Amino acid sequence: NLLARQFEGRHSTGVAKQITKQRVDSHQDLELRAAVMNDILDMIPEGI
Amino acid sequence: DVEFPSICERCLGDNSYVRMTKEPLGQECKICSKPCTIFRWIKERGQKPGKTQICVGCARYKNCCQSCMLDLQFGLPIALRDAALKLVESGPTNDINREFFAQNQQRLLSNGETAYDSQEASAAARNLVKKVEKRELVESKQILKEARASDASLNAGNVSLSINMEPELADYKIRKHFEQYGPLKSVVCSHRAKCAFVNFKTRSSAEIAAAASPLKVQWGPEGEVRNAKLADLV
Amino acid sequence: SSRKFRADKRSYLGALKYLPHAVLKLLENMPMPWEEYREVKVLYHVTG
Amino acid sequence: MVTAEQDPMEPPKFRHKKVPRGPPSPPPPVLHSPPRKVSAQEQQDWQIPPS
Amino acid sequence: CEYLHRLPKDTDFFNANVDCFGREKHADYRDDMGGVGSFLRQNYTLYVGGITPTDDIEEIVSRHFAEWGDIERIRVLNSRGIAFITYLNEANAQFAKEAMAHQSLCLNVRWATTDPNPASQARNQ
Amino acid sequence: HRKGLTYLHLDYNCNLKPTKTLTTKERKKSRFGNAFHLMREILRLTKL
Amino acid sequence: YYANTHAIYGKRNFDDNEATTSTDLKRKSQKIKERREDPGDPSILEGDGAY
Amino acid sequence: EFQGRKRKEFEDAIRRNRLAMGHWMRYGQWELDQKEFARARSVFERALDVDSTYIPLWLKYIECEMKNRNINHARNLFDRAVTQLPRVDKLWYKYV
Amino acid sequence: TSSRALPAHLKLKYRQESQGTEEEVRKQDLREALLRAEAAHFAT
RNA sequence: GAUCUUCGGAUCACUUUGGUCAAAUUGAAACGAUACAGAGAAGAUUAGCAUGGCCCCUGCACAAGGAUGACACUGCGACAUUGAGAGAAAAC
RNA sequence: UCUCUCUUUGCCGGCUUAGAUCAA
Ligand SMILES: [K+]
Ligand SMILES: [Mg+2]
Ligand SMILES: [Mg+2]
Ligand SMILES: [Zn+2]
Ligand SMILES: [Zn+2]
Ligand SMILES: [Zn+2]
């Protein structure tokens, strides 16, 4: 792994990061905001 | 089935029977910046082995040879082809844009349509040769004496010159003109000034060359062009 | 520290991945107290 | 045609560089049902005040 | 030796891939234009810089450059010791470029960039 | 040395000691991981 | 492929004045052998007939 | 150098918020003031790739094509727009 | 590559005979079984 | 050359060349220093966790750190105009 | 039908223990 990272690069893009007891609140808030955005986008009728 | 790289038989050797190896992912395309397989063979015994340098996507979008990059229809460098012939627009020179163009062009070009037809190529070749053959075939008085006398003293409607015997066109044309008039040393010239000064090993050669006189001449940047405008009023 | 072998440095460094295997094979065959020397069959990279 | 064998100790040959994603296939037609009328009254009933 | 110890002639056309000096040509043309040119462009002229002793710079460089190969255009700036000699063939051009670096006329020989003159661009094209 | 960390000296007994006082940037750049240090210590034992 | 390469070399050098047989192989080898200097005798090791 | 500077600032501004159509509209306008074609269309159709359902962008694109008298180009653009959103009458009305 | 990506649980488990395979569920009569179970629950 | 064979010959073996590229200024990276400012949340001191990707660095790491790592976090016109008057103009 | 002005004119950074504390 060390030599692969040395001769290849980080490959930081496209990697996932598990929730680790410190991102729990900041991820729950994101999910709640996304859900509320979806509900807003739905209950508002067309052309309003 | 990843079968062959496209190579012309000028650099495939004069033997109808050659052997070659492939090393997959052995190099990054010098244009695509893409992982591509290498191919190594021998043109003829006794010279360094050749190898392919560009991917299969390229040399095909360019209709070129992966090793020598001579175009597979005319046989002169692909850069000179795309600079003088100008068949179809090329790509950029910067890294990200060049790789982006290479990737998207390979994608839209493997969808099935061919980007290079040789009919238009020959048509453009003949058009270029046709343009080449077509190519083959008181205010003046005040700017005349304004500075000629100044330099002459410092370091020395129609106007007719004098002939004295006091003892677009490149310089090699001058070189192969004065060789029969004596050995050459150096020919310093300038197109803007239109003045070509030569030097010989002996003054006798210079004087005999100059005696051939009856377009010709006999003996800052803009400051040297004052007498070149005399060509307009010669 | 010479350019005469500058082409082999990448391979020379990639064998860092397998070096602990070499350490294990070397320590596994250490000479016992009663033998003055021990000749070992060895396998080496042509790079060295 | 012979596949040249690779050195087992050879590390990764070259770096990998990310490319921004290419353009997608062009969007399809929409085919919606004809829009309904909402009128200014119902436009007003869905107006939210600032917080 | 295993390489030619002579001067390239008119009919010495080489491969576009191999530098006419035996080296190889990349695509990015670098930033200092130092060692070997790119294959995506063909420039027959080279930037030579160095001493600017007197007004005879044109003739001295001509003396020091004709012996290297066929010359096409010599344009030397009078203000500073900057010249843009243009050769006829790639072989002589690059042979002289590589052979005149750090010599006495050290000389900063490099590859010329795109000429901004629309007239010079027109005639070159 | 393929990291630019030429100011760090790896003596023949496998100790990583800087050759000069390091700034914060060098100190953070010249921090190796558990793999490199573990392998260095195993190598030190083998050399012993 | 061997034969074609040999033919190409013969065409390039214009030197094709040989035959082919069983004993002819040895006969061709005879003169190449006589041109060669002898192989020394091992245990003669520093000049004057070194192996 | 001035177009390079404005281009870099607008390009980052549209890379940061790729859903900000106002940035794409302003970029197309500023690019259109001197170099009237080619890359103007590129930038605009990039924005349509971001969101092809933004009718103001379609209308702005049409008007910007018609300012410089490119008629057949604009007719092709209308055909694409009307086959993409057949149930909006603004595009149909402008076309007719 | 990563510690969690190493091979593990390489044998996929399938439902055995008495575990409720598709054959038995198709053979079984779920309706009357469900009503009988509901009645048995109701009786409590 | 060894072996037979009968002085016709037969056996035995049969086409290399790992090439980031020719003896190191001018085609393997990335910077020192000096000079300027010079430490996130509406006073002041200050915990942090996040969002976005042509920004990365340390790390074996899908841990965690690098100032909460840094940068960024705004703003506009598918506005229909008529509601009216005045001097002009061409028009009730 | 122009010019100016007014008016009408629907309208286009997050989280936690308020994060925690505070006298010239
Ligand atoms: K802090
Ligand atoms: Mg962090
Ligand atoms: Mg951060
Ligand atoms: Zn070829
Ligand atoms: Zn390619
Ligand atoms: Zn030599």
UniProtKB/Swiss-Prot annotation, chain D:
Entry similarity comment: Belongs to the SNW family.
Region: Disordered, residue numbers: 5-40
Post-translational modification Phosphoserine, affected residues: 25, 33
Subunit comment: Homodimer. Interacts with cyp1 and the small 23 kDa subunit of the splicing factor U2AF (u2af23).
Biased composition (Pro residues): 21-32
Full protein name: Pre-mRNA-processing protein 45
Purpose of the protein: Involved in pre-mRNA splicing.
S-S pairs: none
Subcellular location: Nucleus
Organism from which the protein derives: Schizosaccharomyces pombe (strain 972 / ATCC 24843)
Swiss-Prot record, chain E:
Positions of the RRM domain: 44-114
Cell compartment(s), UniProt: Nucleus
Domain of life from the UniProt record: Eukaryota
Its biological purpose: Involved in the first step of pre-mRNA splicing. Required for cell growth and cell cycle control. Plays a role in the levels of the U1, U4, U5 and U6 snRNAs and the maintenance of the U4/U6 snRNA complex. May provide the link between the 'nineteen complex' NTC spliceosome protein complex and the spliceosome through the U6 snRNA. Associates predominantly with U6 snRNAs in assembled active spliceosomes. Binds directly to the internal stem-loop (ISL) domain of the U6 snRNA and to the pre-mRNA intron near the 5' splice site during the activation and catalytic phases of the spliceosome cycle.
Similarity-based family: Belongs to the RRM CWC2 family.
Description of how the protein assembles with itself and partners: Belongs to the 40S cdc5-associated complex (or cwf complex), a spliceosome sub-complex reminiscent of a late-stage spliceosome composed of the U2, U5 and U6 snRNAs and at least brr2, cdc5, cwf2/prp3, cwf3/syf1, cwf4/syf3, cwf5/ecm2, spp42/cwf6, cwf7/spf27, cwf8, cwf9, cwf10, cwf11, cwf12, prp45/cwf13, cwf14, cwf15, cwf16, cwf17, cwf18, cwf19, cwf20, cwf21, cwf22, cwf23, cwf24, cwf25, cwf26, cyp7/cwf27, cwf28, cwf29/ist3, lea1, msl1, prp5/cwf1, prp10, prp12/sap130, prp17, prp22, sap61, sap62, sap114, sap145, slu7, smb1, smd1, smd3, smf1, smg1 and syf2.
Protein's name in the database: Pre-mRNA-splicing factor cwf2
Shown stretch of the complete protein: 131 to 259 of 388
From Swiss-Prot, chain F:
Subcellular localization, as worded in the UniProt entry: Nucleus
Organism expressing this protein natively: Schizosaccharomyces pombe (strain 972 / ATCC 24843)
Parent-protein residues present: 532 to 579 of 2363
Assembly behavior: Belongs to the 40S cdc5-associated complex (or cwf complex), a spliceosome sub-complex reminiscent of a late-stage spliceosome composed of the U2, U5 and U6 snRNAs and at least brr2, cdc5, cwf2/prp3, cwf3/syf1, cwf4/syf3, cwf5/ecm2, spp42/cwf6, cwf7/spf27, cwf8, cwf9, cwf10, cwf11, cwf12, prp45/cwf13, cwf14, cwf15, cwf16, cwf17, cwf18, cwf19, cwf20, cwf21, cwf22, cwf23, cwf24, cwf25, cwf26, cyp7/cwf27, cwf28, cwf29/ist3, lea1, msl1, prp5/cwf1, prp10, prp12/sap130, prp17, prp22, sap61, sap62, sap114, sap145, slu7, smb1, smd1, smd3, smf1, smg1 and syf2. Interacts with prp1.
Name the UniProt record assigns to this protein: Pre-mRNA-splicing factor spp42
Purpose: Involved in pre-mRNA splicing. May be involved in endoplasmic reticulum-associated protein degradation (ERAD) and required for growth at low and high temperatures. Required for pre-spliceosome formation, which is the first step of pre-mRNA splicing. This protein is associated with snRNP U5. Has a role in branch site-3' splice site selection. Associates with the branch site-3' splice 3'-exon region.
Curated annotation (Swiss-Prot), chain G:
Localization per record: Nucleus
Biased composition (Basic and acidic residues): 24-39
Summary of the function given for this chain in its UniProt record: Functions in the second step of pre-mRNA splicing. Involved in splicing intron which are longer than 200 nucleotides.
Assembly with partners or alone: Belongs to the 40S cdc5-associated complex (or cwf complex), a spliceosome sub-complex reminiscent of a late-stage spliceosome composed of the U2, U5 and U6 snRNAs and at least brr2, cdc5, cwf2/prp3, cwf3/syf1, cwf4/syf3, cwf5/ecm2, spp42/cwf6, cwf7/spf27, cwf8, cwf9, cwf10, cwf11, cwf12, prp45/cwf13, cwf14, cwf15, cwf16, cwf17, cwf18, cwf19, cwf20, cwf21, cwf22, cwf23, cwf24, cwf25, cwf26, cyp7/cwf27, cwf28, cwf29/ist3, lea1, msl1, prp5/cwf1, prp10, prp12/sap130, prp17, prp22, sap61, sap62, sap114, sap145, slu7, smb1, smd1, smd3, smf1, smg1 and syf2.
The protein, known as: Pre-mRNA-processing factor 17
Taxonomic placement: Eukaryota, Fungi, Dikarya, Ascomycota, Taphrinomycotina
Gene coding for it: prp17
Positions spanned in the full protein: 103 to 153 of 558
